[PDB]
């Protein structure tokens, strides 16, 4: 028996030609990046930064 | 003076390889008989 608006999934259809990769960075690492990019001791990458 | 070693003569021969894996049997088409009617 199957009811309307059912919370339980009947089947799962997923496609993967790209795949999202969820990656967790600790916030103190982002904060020391924001402290070091403002000073001249670490220059921003630019064109290669997204890879 | 020269030593005396023991050889095996290894020859190429085909092998298969299969691995056991756990798991649980489920029924083919189970129907959870559940009503569509309120009553006694």
Curated annotation (Swiss-Prot), chain A:
Induction: By growth under severe iron limitation. It is found in: Cell inner membrane. Disruption phenotype: Disruption of MexA, MexB and OprM significantly reduces active efflux of N-(3-oxododecanoyl) homoserine lactone/3-oxo-C12-HSL/PAI-1, but not N-butyryl homoserine lactone/C4-HSL/PAI-2. It comes from the Bacteria. Belongs to the membrane fusion protein (MFP) (TC 8.A.1) family. The periplasmic linker component of the MexAB-OprM efflux system that confers multidrug resistance. Functions as the major efflux pump for n-hexane and p-xylene efflux. Has been shown in one study to be involved in the active efflux of the autoinducer N-(3-oxododecanoyl) homoserine lactone, thereby playing an indirect role in quorum-sensing; but has been shown in another study not to be involved in efflux of this autoinducer. Over-expression of the pump increases antibiotic and solvent efflux capacities. Implicated in the secretion of the siderophore pyoverdine. Component of the MexAB-OprM multidrug efflux complex, composed of six MexA subunits forming a hexameric tube, binding to a MexB trimer, which interact with the trimeric OprM outer membrane channel protein. OprM is thought to not directly contact MexB; instead, MexA joins MexB and OprM by forming a funnel-like hexamer anchored to the inner membrane. MexA may initially form a hexameric ring complex with MexB prior to OprM, then OprM undergoes a conformational change as it contacts MexA, allowing the periplasmic gate to open. In both X-ray crystal structures approximately the last 100 residues are not ordered. This is Multidrug resistance protein MexA. The gene is mexA. The chain holds residues 178 to 228 of 383 of the full protein.
